[PDB]
Design a protein around this ligand. Structure first.
Ligand SMILES: OCc1nc2cc(Cl)c(Cl)cc2[nH]1
Ligand SMILES: [Cl-]
Length: 409
């Protein structure tokens, strides 16, 4: 009967494994260099397209970390890629020297809702000018699919293939695959692992994108919960000083200047490098490799809706649903496309921001929802279970804030 109590405190901070709305890509088009498809080779070719590098410096220090070490670590990346430039054959992988900065970096409280997480979610729902999946990406069926299932899949794919949340899926699939693979292929090495994604422009040109790099620590992962540490180094045009509370976990460097087209003419903007230490485990990297299931899960939520409409109207409502034909007289989100991308964005953010706070909040808030709906239509301890999960997680706090909007109306 009353809105949830969200915790008071300093604003919550970014805790994703890689940058989301703030990421920046160095890209090469229709790659054709010798060794296309070897990540390190792709990364160096992406690096060469940029000529605006400059002497790096800290612009937003990590309050609890050793900021000279993060700076030294980025300078070591540039120098070891410069070493590779001198060798005749570019090696398949690059193992970093076990410097003191990398040994330190690799390890060898109530927060309030901040506006940035809602902004992230809005960004995840948007369309990008590139496609991130193939037409037949979704599904893993053994047999050929029926006509109706295919039609629904083709409609849905057309609405989400360019979605920003789909970029996050493929970005996450790539980096988790590369890290999990390096975790057993190079157990004792501080391996340099580029952060790559691949897309296709509106004109059909294939493109290869570099977001940055991670460096992994030692990884003798005997079980699913063993942690491999890593250091992430991610390009960005986001000035960390605008929302410093978001970047509590980062040392942020200024490392270059980039020339951009904009609504005014060409403009020069500083390029930043977001640096943090982080960790993940076998089981989280396996889930990261499965993020394409976000596409399947949200398609199935759509298909549930179409099947309901088909059962009430005694005919298949797929075309009527996706083309937006008591029949509904519009879409609350504004379009069928927005409903699909919103469902996907929720599913992807559930994965990007998985936590026990989210698992508890999801279960307990569903109980209070069904109860409040039953009281609404026909007219203590549960609240504690819900609010016990409202501590500091941006995604949980946002979903609780959404819940409270449901309670008001
Ligand atoms: O160590 C200085 C240095 N290393 C570099 C490595 C690369 Cl790939 C580029 Cl584009 C510029 C660099 N500058
Ligand atoms: Cl799949």
């Amino acid at each position: 009967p009353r809105p949830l109590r969200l915790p008071d405190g300093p604003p919550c901070s970014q805790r994703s494994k890689f940058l989301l709305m703030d990421a920046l890509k160095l890209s090469i088009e229709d790659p054709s260099h010798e060794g296309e498809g070897i990540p390190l080779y792709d990364a160096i070719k992406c690096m060469r397209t940029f000529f605006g590098w400059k002497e790096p410096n800290v612009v937003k220090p990590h309050e609890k970390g050793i900021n000279p070490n993060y700076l030294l670590s980025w300078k070591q990346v540039l120098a070891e890629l410069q070493d590779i430039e001198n060798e005749e054959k570019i090696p398949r992988t690059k193992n970093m020297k076990k410097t003191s900065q990398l040994k330190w970096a690799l390890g060898e409280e109530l927060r309030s809702l901040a506006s940035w997480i809602q902004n992230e979610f809005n960004k995840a729902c948007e369309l990008t000018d590139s496609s991130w999946i193939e037409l037949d990406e979704i599904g893993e069926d053994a047999a050929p699919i029926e006509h109706i299932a295919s039609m629904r899949r083709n409609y849905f794919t057309a609405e989400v293939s360019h979605c920003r949340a789909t970029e996050y899926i493929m970005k996450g699939v790539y980096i988790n695959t590369a890290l999990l693979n390096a975790s057993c292929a190079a157990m004792d090495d501080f391996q340099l692992i580029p952060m790559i994604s691949k897309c296709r422009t509106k004109e059909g040109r294939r493109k290869t994108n570099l977001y940055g790099f991670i460096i992994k620590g030692r990884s003798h992962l005997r079980n699913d919960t063993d942690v491999v540490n890593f250091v992430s180094m991610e390009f960005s045009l986001t000035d960390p000083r605008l929302e410093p509370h978001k970047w509590e976990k980062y040392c942020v460097l200024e490392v270059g200047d980039m020339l951009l087209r904009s609504a005014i003419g060409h403009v020069s903007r500083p390029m930043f490098l977001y640096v943090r230490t982080n960790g993940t485990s076998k089981i989280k990297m396996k889930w990261g490799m499965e993020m394409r299931r976000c596409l399947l899960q949200s398609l199935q939520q759509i298909e549930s809706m179409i099947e309901a409409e088909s059962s009430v109207k005694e005919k298949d409502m797929t075309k009527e649903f996706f083309e937006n034909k008591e029949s509904p007289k519009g879409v609350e989100e504004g379009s069928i496309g927005k409903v699909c991308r919103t469902l996907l964005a929720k599913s992807v953010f559930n994965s990007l921001y998985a936590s026990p706070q989210l698992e508890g909040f999801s279960a307990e808030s569903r109980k209070l929802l069904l109860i409040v709906q039953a009281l609404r239509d026909n007219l203590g301890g549960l609240y504690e279970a819900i609010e016990e999960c409202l501590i500091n997680d941006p995604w949980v706090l946002l979903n609780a804030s959404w819940f409270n909007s449901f309670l008001t109306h």
